[PDB]
TrEMBL record, chain A:
Protein's name in the database: 30S ribosomal protein S31, mitochondrial
Family classification: Belongs to the bacterial ribosomal protein bTHX family.
Organism (species): Brassica oleracea var. oleracea
Entry GO CC: plastid; ribonucleoprotein complex; ribosome
Keywords assigned by UniProt, alphabetized: Ribonucleoprotein, Ribosomal protein
Gene Ontology terms: biological process: plastid translation
Source organism, top-level taxon: Eukaryota
Part of the whole protein covered: 45 to 94 of 94
TrEMBL record, chain B:
Compartments (UniProt record): Mitochondrion
Parent-protein start and end of this portion: 97 to 483 of 483
Residues annotated as signal peptide: none
Highest taxon of source: Eukaryota
GO cellular component: mitochondrial small ribosomal subunit
Listed name of the protein: Small ribosomal subunit protein mS29
Family statement: Belongs to the mitochondrion-specific ribosomal protein mS29 family.
Compositionally biased intervals (Basic and acidic residues): 4-18
This protein's UniProt keywords: Mitochondrion, Ribonucleoprotein, Ribosomal protein, Transit peptide
Alphabetized GO MF terms: structural constituent of ribosome
TrEMBL record, chain D:
GO BP terms in the entry: translation
Record-stated family: Belongs to the universal ribosomal protein uS13 family.
Keyword Protein biosynthesis appears in the UniProt entry: no
Top-level division of the source organism's lineage: Eukaryota
Protein name: Uncharacterized protein
Segments for region (Disordered): 89-110
Species in which this protein is naturally found: Brassica oleracea var. oleracea
GO cellular component: mitochondrion; small ribosomal subunit
Keywords: Ribonucleoprotein, Ribosomal protein
From TrEMBL, chain E:
Family: Belongs to the universal ribosomal protein uS7 family.
Any Pfam family: Ribosomal_S7
Protein name per UniProt: Small ribosomal subunit protein uS7m
Quaternary context: Part of the small ribosomal subunit.
Gene3D superfamilies to which the protein is assigned, alphabetical: Ribosomal protein S7 domain
Species of origin: Brassica oleracea var. botrytis (Cauliflower)
Swiss-Prot/TrEMBL GO biological process terms: translation
Gene: rps7
Keyword annotations of the record: Mitochondrion, Ribonucleoprotein, Ribosomal protein, RNA-binding, rRNA-binding
TM helices/strands, residue ranges: none
Cited function: One of the primary rRNA binding proteins, it binds directly to 18S rRNA where it nucleates assembly of the head domain of the small subunit.
Domain Small ribosomal subunit protein uS7: 18-149
Gene Ontology CC: one annotated term: mitochondrial small ribosomal subunit
Length: 50, 380, 108, 110, 157, 113, 131, 47, 78
RNA sequence: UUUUUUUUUUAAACUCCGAAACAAACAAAAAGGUGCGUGACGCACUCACGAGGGACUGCCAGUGAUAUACUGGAGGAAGGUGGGGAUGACGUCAAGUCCGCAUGGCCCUUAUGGGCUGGGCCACACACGUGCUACAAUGGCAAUUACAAUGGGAAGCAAGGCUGUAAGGCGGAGCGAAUCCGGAAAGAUUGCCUCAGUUCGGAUUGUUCUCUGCAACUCGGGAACAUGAAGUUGGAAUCGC
C-alpha cells in the first residue's frame, strides 16, 4: 500500500504527515496520556520508564 | 497420530516403576502425595507438586493461566515446580493473615520481573493455597479482558465508563467458586444500587435504583448483578466496597496482567466530528474500583510482558512505592530440576542428556522457562 | 572477567537487547567452543550497524577477549573462524548503474 | 439491514459492513461505531435501540442517494457553466492536470 | 553457521546435516527475510522432537528417498532437440530433493489452506515412507531418463 | 597533567583544504593539539557537454580542521592578541576563541536580594 | 586562577574570525556567551525556582550553570552589553519570589485564623475598643 | 497544602517578564503575524 | 471568525481601482478571480491568440477568468 | 545458636526535664527512597587526525622443462589481482555537440535583433522505451518495542511548549556547527482480518482547506473526508546479476 496516500506507508512514500502517519508530537501526547501525566510536562519526561 | 502415541505408551509404562522418579544427584523428583500446598517447607524446594487437572480446574474455575496450560501441554503432566519465591510469597501472606505466637510484611505486592519468569504460575499457586485455606479470593487471570472488547457507555453521574458484559463476566467468575461462601456473608452496605446503561438496550424505563433487601447476602447481591444487565457495573463497585468490610474470612484480590490497567483500553471516545480520543483503563468503572492499592486489603497484582503493554513509570500511580517486587527467573538448581523433569517426562532422549547440554540450554535461554522448554527437544 | 554467567549489553540484560534466539546462540558460540560457559561475567558496549552486525561484532570482541585471557584458547577459536574479522562491507554505488552491480535495463 | 440507502450484510462485522453505505468509509465507520459505544459486532446482533441509534448517527453525515445526487449536480454545474473542468468532464478527459499523451486509460476505456 | 545458529550452538551435526538445514532454510527465503521461514522450519523440527526420536536423522533419511540418481538435459542435434540423460552430483541431488520437497509443501499449502508447518511436516513424512508428490517427481524424472536412454552418447558434460 | 585546560585560555581553530602538519613551522605555539573529523562534499557532473548521461566524473571538497589550546593568564591576553592578529597560517583561515573571567558587581541588585 | 576583586565569577566567551582577503566580516563574529554559577548569586530557593522558570533550558542543573548567549545585535560589544543587561534583568525578576511567598504565607495564615471560633471574639473586641 | 501553594505561586507572571527581558514576541492567541517575515535577513544585496 | 479562508482571492491591480469599468473591454488577466460584483458584465478574455467573449453570471463567481477562455483547440485525429 | 582462646573500643542522643497549641517545615543546616546529571582523575577503550608497518608465491609439500608456472598446506586480520574505485594505447565510426563556450564561411539588419503581457513546451484515435505502485497470507492494518550510515543547516536547521482531526499556524533552547537541530524502515512482541476483487490494490472524481510565490485557470506540492477503475502473476520475446 505504498501508493495509498491515506495510509502510513503511502505518506512515508510521499514524505508527508497526517492522521495515518502523525508527527513526533503525536507520540509525545500519546505517551503523556498513557502515563497519566499533564500535557504541560516537559519532554523528555522526568521519570524512569521500566 | 502415531507420533505422540509411542511417547504416551512410554509414559504410561514409566509410572508403574517408582524408581524412575529421580532428580538431580538422586533426589526424589516429586513431593510426597500426603503433602499439600500449605505443608510445603524449605526441604520441598526444587521438587515437584503433582496435581489433578479436574481438581485443579475445580479450585480454579476462572480458567487456568496460559503458562500453566502451555507447560501442561508440553510436559503431559499436571505438575509444577516448588520454588523459593512462591514459598516466600505464601509465607508473607500467611504472616499477614495470622501473626505467629524484623522483616515487615507487605499487604500490597506487584509481582514484576523478566518475561516468562513464572509470575502467572506463582499467582495461580498462591490462589490455590488461599482457596485451600478457605479465603474469599477474587481471581482475574486475564486482566486484559477488563479493558478490551464489548460495549462502553459514559456514566452520567461519576463520569467513568461502564462495561456491562465484562462486569457480568467478573461476577460469574467470582460466584463460580464463591457460591457456598457468599451465601453465608451478609451485606454491610444497604444503599440502593443505582442502575446504569444496559448492554445495547439503554436505560431501564421508570426504574433508577434497585433497593437492597434486609436479609440479602453477598450471593444475592452478586446474583442481582448477574441477572440484570443494568446493574452489573454498580454491583461490581458495591462488591469492591463489600470486600473491604468482610471480617469472617481473609479477603485476597489477585489480578494477573495487572499492567494492562495502567495503559490505554480498546475503547475510543468521539471528542470531535473528525477525531476520536482513546480511553484510558483508569477511566473504566470496574478498573477504577479495583486498580488502587492504597487501602488495607490484601491485594496482589502480577505484571505481564507477553502482552504488548510497553513501558510504564517506575513510580506507578495509586500504588505504594514499596509494592513492586522482583520475581526472578530460574537459577542453576531450578534449571537442573527442570531439565531432569523434562528427562523424566521424555521431552528429550535419554542418550543425549549431559550436564553440558542442559547448561547450554539454560545459558542460551537465560532462565526463560518457555524458551527452555522449547529448547530441550533440540538437545543432542 | 570470571564469574557465574552474567552478560550485559549496553547496560541491559542480553535477552532484552537480543530477544531472538539465534542472535544469542551466535553470541554464546565462542564460549561453548572453549567449554567455558557460566564462567564469565561479560559486560559489553556496542554501537552502529544493525542487529546481526552488532552480534558479529560482540562475537569477535568476545573471542579476542578470550584469547587475551588465555592464549592457549586460540586453537579452538581459530578452528571455528571466530578470530577472523569479517571484512565484507557494503559495496559503493557506481555512476551510470542502478546499484553497485545491477545495471539499468538495456534496450536490445 | 437497510442503513442509509444501502444493504448492510447480516453476516459481516458492522465496521466492515457500514462502509457499504455511500458517503461512509473506513474513518467514518469507526467514528460512528465509537459514537455508539461499540467496538465491533455482527450486524444481525444489533438490538432495536441500537438500530435507531445507528440510523441517527449516519444521519448526521451526508450520505446515500442524496449525496450521490449532490455530487452529480456539482459535476453538472461544472459542465453547464462551461469552465475548463466542465469541458474535461463532458469530453471524457482528466481534469486534474494529468497527461493525456500516454496514460489517460482510466478516464478513457480499454 | 549464518543460518540456524541454534543448531550450530548445540552442535552434534556433520557437514551434510548442516548443509541440509541451510538449504531447507535458505531455498524459500525471499527479499532477504529469513526469520519467518526459519521459524516455520523450527516448528517443523519441533513437532516430532517433542515425542522422543531424532528429527535430523529422520530428515536425512527423508531427503535420501527423494535424491534423483539421473536427470535429463536438452541437447539440439542437427536442428532437432533431443533429451540426453545424465548423472546427478550429490550436492545437486540434495538441492533437487529439498527443492521438490519445498515445492510440494508450498503447493499443498496453496491447495489445502492450512498452516505451512503442517504441510512441511506432512510432505517430509510422505517422503519418509517413499510416497507423495516429491516421490512422484523423482519417479517421473527417472522414467524420463530411462525413456531417452538411447539418446545417450550425445552427451557433452 | 593530561586533563582538560579549563580556565583563562585562547583556543585556535584552523580550517584548511590541506593538512597543517605539512607546514607545522607556521603554527602558533600551543599547549594541546586536536583534530576534527574530515568532512567532504561530493560533486558528480556530466563529462560530455551533450547527451552522454551514463558517463560521470566525481569530485570532492574535503574539509580539514585542527584545534589548538593556548594556556594563558588574564594579563597576557591583549599582548598575545596583538601578534595573533598578524599571523600567516599557510592556506588556512584561523579562529580565535577567548575564555576570560570577570567578577559580577551585585551592588545594583543587592537591594532586591 | 580566579579573577580579582570580590563577587560571583563570570565566564565570558568570544570569537574572532580572521578571513583572508580584506573582507573581515564573518557571521561568527558577534556572538558572545556569558556563564555563571547560580549558587554564587546567593539566591534563596524560591528565587532560584523563579529564575529557573524564567530561564528554562539555558540553565544546566548538573553544572549549576546559567548560560546567556546574545547574537541579536550586530556587534560583539553590543552582545557583551546585552548579556550583562539580561543577567541583571533575570536577577531583578527572580528576586521578587520572596515577596510573593511572604504575601501568600500571610494570606494562608489569615485565612486559617478566620477558620477558628476563638479568635474572632478577641479581634472584634480589639477593633471595638479602639474603633 | 501550603508547600504546593508556595512552589506554584512563585512561578506565575513569568511569561511577560521573560518576553520583556529577552525581547520576545508575545502572541497568545496565535494568529498569523508579520513577525516571521520580519525576523529573517534581507538578501537583496547578496543577490 | 466568520472567514473560512484567511487569504483574499487575487485580483490584478488595474481591476482594483476602476472595478467594473475595466470589464467592458479586452482582458489579458487570466489569473484574476471573478468577484460577486462582476455579475452582469461582458468580458473578452485573452487565450493566447484571441480575446474569447464571456458573459459573467452567478455561477462564474469564485472562478478564474482563464477558466472560460480555452487556450488549446479541441483536436481530432483523421 | 552456644562453649571458649586471642586482640581493640566505651559531648550526642531519650519515651527525661521545659514549652508551644498555629501549621509548619520556612535564611541556610535535619531524615529516608529515588530520577536526571556534573566536577576531579583521566583519554585505558571507542573514535578522530598525522606518520607508518603488514602480503611478497615470502615458507613447506607435490605436479611439471631444474624455468615460468599450477595444485594444496602452515602462519596470518587478510593468500595468490584481499574487496571496490580511479586510471582508458594506435586508430575507427566524416560517431555527438555551432542550442554550454569559442570559432572560418554564408545569411538577417524598422528584424532572423531587443522588451513586455498572454499562451505553448503539460495537446491525444495510436505506437515504442525507461520506471513507480500492485495483483496479496513469505500478507494488509493497529498497538508496543529495537538497531544505522551518508550527508545538510543563516534566503537556514529549528528542542520544549500552545492551537488545529490533519496539512498547517504561533513562538523560539541551541547551532555558520565531532558541541545545537529531523521517532530510519524492513525486524521482533501482541491482536484483528481468513482467501473474497477482500481491512488486497488506490486509479478516477467531488467538497472543504493549507504552503510557497506578484501570481497556482491552462499548469505546482500537501492535508481532511468521501468516491473505490484496471489488476487475481502477464504470449512471442527480452533485461540484470
Ligand atoms: N513453577 C513452575 N513450574 C513449572 N514450569 C514453570 C514454573 N514457573 C515457570 N515455568 C515455565 O515458565 C513458563 C513461563 O511462566 P509464566 O507464564 O508464569 O510467565 P510470566 O512470568 O507470568 O510471564 P509473562 O511476562 O509472559 O506474563 C511457563 O509456561 C512454564 O513453562
Ligand atoms: K496535461
Ligand atoms: K597487492
Ligand atoms: K493550478
Ligand atoms: Mg489498503
Ligand atoms: Mg515540537
Ligand atoms: Mg496537540
Ligand atoms: Mg503471565
Ligand atoms: Mg544497498
Ligand atoms: Mg562504503
Ligand atoms: Mg558540516
Ligand atoms: Mg591513546
Ligand atoms: Mg592456503
Ligand atoms: Mg556526422
Ligand atoms: Mg546528428
Ligand atoms: Mg514571455
Ligand atoms: Mg534564542
Ligand atoms: Mg512489519
Ligand atoms: Mg503476528
Ligand atoms: Mg479495499
Ligand atoms: Mg492547492
Ligand atoms: Mg477484474
Ligand atoms: Mg487472491
Amino acid at each position: 500500500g505504498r501508493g495509498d496516500s491515506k495510509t502510513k506507508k503511502g505518506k512515508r512514500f510521499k514524505g508527508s504527515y497526517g492522521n495515518s502517519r502523525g508527527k513526533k508530537q503525536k507520540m509525545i501526547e500519546r505517551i503523556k496520556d498513557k502515563l497519566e501525566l499533564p500535557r504541560s510536562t516537559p519532554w523528555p519526561l522526568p521519570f524512569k520508564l521500566i | 497420530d502415531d507420533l505422540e502415541a509411542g511417547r504416551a505408551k512410554r509414559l504410561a509404562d514409566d509410572e508403574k516403576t517408582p524408581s524412575l522418579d529421580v532428580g538431580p544427584n538422586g533426589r526424589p523428583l516429586f513431593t510426597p502425595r500426603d503433602v499439600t500446598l500449605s505443608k510445603l517447607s524449605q526441604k520441598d524446594i526444587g521438587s515437584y507438586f503433582n496435581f489433578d487437572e479436574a481438581a485443579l480446574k475445580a479450585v480454579l474455575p476462572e480458567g487456568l493461566a496460559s503458562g500453566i496450560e502451555d507447560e501442561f501441554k508440553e510436559s503431559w503432566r499436571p505438575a509444577l515446580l516448588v520454588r523459593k519465591s512462591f514459598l516466600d510469597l505464601r509465607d508473607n501472606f500467611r504472616r499477614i493473615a495470622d501473626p505467629p505466637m524484623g522483616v515487615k510484611p507487605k499487604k500490597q505486592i506487584i509481582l514484576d520481573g523478566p518475561v516468562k519468569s513464572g509470575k502467572s504460575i506463582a499467582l495461580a499457586m498462591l490462589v490455590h493455597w488461599a482457596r485451600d485455606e478457605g479465603w474469599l479470593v477474587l481471581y482475574a487471570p486475564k486482566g486484559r479482558d477488563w479493558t478490551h472488547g464489548g460495549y462502553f457507555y459514559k456514566n452520567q453521574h461519576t463520569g467513568f465508563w461502564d462495561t456491562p458484559l465484562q462486569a457480568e463476566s467478573i461476577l460469574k467468575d467470582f460466584v463460580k467458586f464463591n457460591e457456598p461462601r457468599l451465601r453465608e456473608l451478609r451485606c454491610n452496605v444497604y444503599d440502593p444500587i443505582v442502575l446504569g446503561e444496559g448492554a445495547g438496550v439503554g436505560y431501564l424505563k421508570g426504574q433508577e435504583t434497585m433497593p437492597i433487601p434486609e436479609d440479602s447476602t453477598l450471593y444475592d447481591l452478586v446474583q442481582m448483578g448477574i441477572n440484570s444487565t443494568h446493574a452489573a457495573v454498580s454491583v461490581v463497585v458495591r462488591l469492591r466496597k463489600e470486600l473491604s468490610l468482610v471480617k469472617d474470612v481473609p479477603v485476597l484480590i489477585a489480578i494477573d496482567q495487572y499492567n494492562n490497567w495502567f495503559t490505554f483500553s480498546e475503547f475510543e471516545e468521539p471528542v470531535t466530528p473528525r477525531s476520536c480520543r482513546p480511553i484510558h483503563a483508569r477511566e473504566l468503572t470496574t478498573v477504577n474500583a479495583f486498580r488502587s492499592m492504597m487501602h488495607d486489603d490484601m491485594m496482589v497484582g502480577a505484571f505481564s510482558h507477553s502482552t504488548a503493554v510497553g513501558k510504564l513509570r517506575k513510580d506507578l500511580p495509586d500504588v505504594p512505592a514499596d509494592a513492586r517486587q522482583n520475581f526472578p527467573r530460574y537459577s542453576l538448581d531450578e534449571a537442573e530440576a527442570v531439565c531432569y523433569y523434562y528427562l523424566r517426562q521424555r521431552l528429550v532422549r535419554r542418550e543425549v542428556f549431559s550436564e553440558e547440554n542442559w547448561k547450554k540450554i539454560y545459558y542460551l535461554a537465560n532462565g526463560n522457562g518457555a524458551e527452555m522448554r522449547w529448547l530441550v527437544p533440540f538437545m543432542r | 572477567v570470571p564469574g557465574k554467567g552474567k552478560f550485559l549489553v549496553n547496560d541491559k540484560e542480553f535477552d532484552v537487547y537480543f530477544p531472538m534466539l539465534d542472535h544469542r546462540a551466535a553470541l554464546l558460540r565462542p564460549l561453548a567452543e572453549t567449554k567455558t560457559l557460566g564462567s564469565w561475567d561479560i559486560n559489553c558496549t556496542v554501537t552502529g550497524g544493525g542487529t546481526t552486525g552488532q552480534v558479529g561484532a560482540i562475537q569477535l570482541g568476545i573471542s579476542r577477549a578470550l584469547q587475551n585471557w588465555e592464549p592457549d584458547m586460540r586453537t579452538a577459536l581459530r578452528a571455528a573462524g571466530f578470530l577472523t574479522r569479517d571484512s565484507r562491507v557494503v559495496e559503493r554505488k557506481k555512476p551510470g548503474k542502478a546499484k553497485a552491480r545491477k545495471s539499468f535495463q538495456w534496450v536490445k | 439491514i437497510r442503513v442509509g440507502n444501502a444493504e448492510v450484510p447480516n453476516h459481516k462485522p458492522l465496521k466492515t459492513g457500514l462502509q457499504e453505505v455511500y458517503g461512509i468509509g473506513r474513518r467514518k465507520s469507526h467514528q460512528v461505531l465509537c459514537g455508539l459505544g461499540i467496538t465491533n459486532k455482527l450486524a444481525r446482533d444489533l438490538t432495536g435501540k441500537e438500530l435507531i441509534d445507528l440510523r441517527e448517527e449516519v444521519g448526521m453525515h451526508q450520505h446515500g442517494d442524496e449525496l450521490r445526487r449532490r455530487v452529480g449536480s456539482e459535476i453538472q454545474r461544472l459542465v453547464e457553466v462551461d469552465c475548463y473542468r466542465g469541458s474535461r468532464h463532458r469530453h471524457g478527459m482528466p481534469c486534474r492536470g494529468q497527461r493525456t499523451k500516454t496514460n489517460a486509460r482510466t478516464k478513457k476505456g480499454k | 553457521x549464518x543460518x540456524x545458529x541454534x543448531x550450530x550452538x548445540x552442535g552434534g551435526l556433520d557437514g551434510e546435516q548442516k548443509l541440509l538445514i541451510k538449504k531447507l532454510v535458505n531455498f524459500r527465503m525471499k527479499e532477504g527475510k529469513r526469520t519467518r521461514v526459519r521459524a516455520i522450519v523450527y516448528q517443523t523440527f519441533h513437532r516430532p522432537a517433542r515425542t522422543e526420536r531424532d528429527v535430523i536423522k529422520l530428515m536425512v533419511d527423508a531427503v535420501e528417498n527423494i535424491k534423483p540418481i539421473c536427470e535429463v538435459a536438452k541437447v539440439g542435434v542437427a536442428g532437432t532437440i533431443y533429451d540426453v540423460p545424465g548423472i546427478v552430483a550429490r550436492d545437486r541431488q540434495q538441492t533437487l530433493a529439498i527443492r521438490w520437497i519445498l515445492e510440494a509443501a508450498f503447493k499443498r499449502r496453496i491447495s489445502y489452506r492450512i498452516s505451512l508447518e503442517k504441510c512441511s511436516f506432512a510432505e517430509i513424512l510422505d517422503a519418509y515412507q517413499k510416497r507423495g508428490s516429491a516421490r512422484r517427481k523423482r519417479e517421473n524424472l527417472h522414467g524420463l531418463a530411462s525413456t531417452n536412454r538411447s539418446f545417450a552418447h550425445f552427451r557433452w558434460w | 597533567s593530561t586533563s582538560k585546560i579549563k580556565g583563562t585560555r585562547i583556543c585556535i581553530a584552523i580550517r584548511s583544504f590541506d593538512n597543517p602538519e605539512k607546514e607545522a613551522w607556521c603554527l602558533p605555539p600551543h599547549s594541546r593539539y586536536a583534530a576534527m573529523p574530515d568532512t567532504r562534499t561530493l560533486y558528480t557532473v556530466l563529462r560530455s557537454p551533450h547527451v552522454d548521461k551514463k558517463s560521470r566524473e566525481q569530485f570532492e571538497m574535503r574539509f580539514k580542521k585542527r584545534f589548538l589550546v593556548i594556556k594563558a593568564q588574564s594579563h597576557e591576553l591583549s599582548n598575545k592578541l596583538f601578534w595573533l592578529k598578524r599571523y600567516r597560517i599557510l592556506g588556512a583561515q584561523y579562529e580565535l576563541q577567548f575564555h576570560c573571567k570577570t567578577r559580577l558587581d551585585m551592588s545594583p541588585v543587592l537591594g532586591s536580594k | 586562577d580566579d579573577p580579582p576583586g570580590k563577587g560571583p565569577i563570570l565566564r565570558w566567551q568570544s570569537r574572532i574570525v580572521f578571513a583572508p582577503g580584506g573582507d573581515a566580516w564573518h557571521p561568527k563574529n558577534r556572538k558572545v556567551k556569558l556563564s555563571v554559577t547560580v549558587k554564587e548569586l546567593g539566591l534563596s530557593k524560591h528565587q532560584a525556582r523563579r529564575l529557573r522558570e524564567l530561564v528554562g533550558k539555558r540553565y544546566d542543573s548538573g553544572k549549576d550553570e546559567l548560560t546567556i548567549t546574545s547574537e541579536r545585535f550586530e556587534h560583539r560589544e553590543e552582545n557583551r552589553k546585552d548579556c550583562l543587561r539580561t543577567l541583571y534583568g533575570l536577577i531583578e525578576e527572580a528576586a521578587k519570589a520572596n515577596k510573593i511567598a511572604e504575601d501568600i504565607r500571610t494570606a494562608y495564615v489569615k485565612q486559617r485564623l478566620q477558620a477558628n471560633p476563638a479568635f474572632m471574639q478577641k479581634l472584634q473586641a480589639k477593633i471595638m475598643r479602639s474603633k | 497544602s501550603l508547600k504546593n501553594l508556595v512552589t506554584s505561586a512563585v512561578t506565575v507572571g513569568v511569561t511577560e517578564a521573560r518576553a520583556r527581558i529577552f525581547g520576545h514576541m508575545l502572541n497568545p492567541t496565535g494568529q498569523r503575524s508579520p513577525h516571521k517575515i520580519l525576523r529573517k535577513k534581507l538578501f537583496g544585496d547578496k543577490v | 471568525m466568520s472567514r473560512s479562508v484567511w487569504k483574499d482571492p487575487f485580483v490584478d491591480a488595474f481591476l482594483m481601482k476602476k472595478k467594473n469599468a475595466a470589464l467592458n473591454r479586452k482582458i489579458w488577466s487570466r489569473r484574476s478571480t471573478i468577484l460577486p460584483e462582476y455579475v452582469d458584465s461582458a468580458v473578452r478574455i485573452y487565450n493566447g491568440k484571441t480575446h474569447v467573449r464571456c458573459k459573467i453570471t452567478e455561477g462564474k463567481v469564485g472562478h478564474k477568468f482563464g477558466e472560460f477562455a480555452f487556450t488549446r483547440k479541441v483536436k481530432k485525429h483523421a
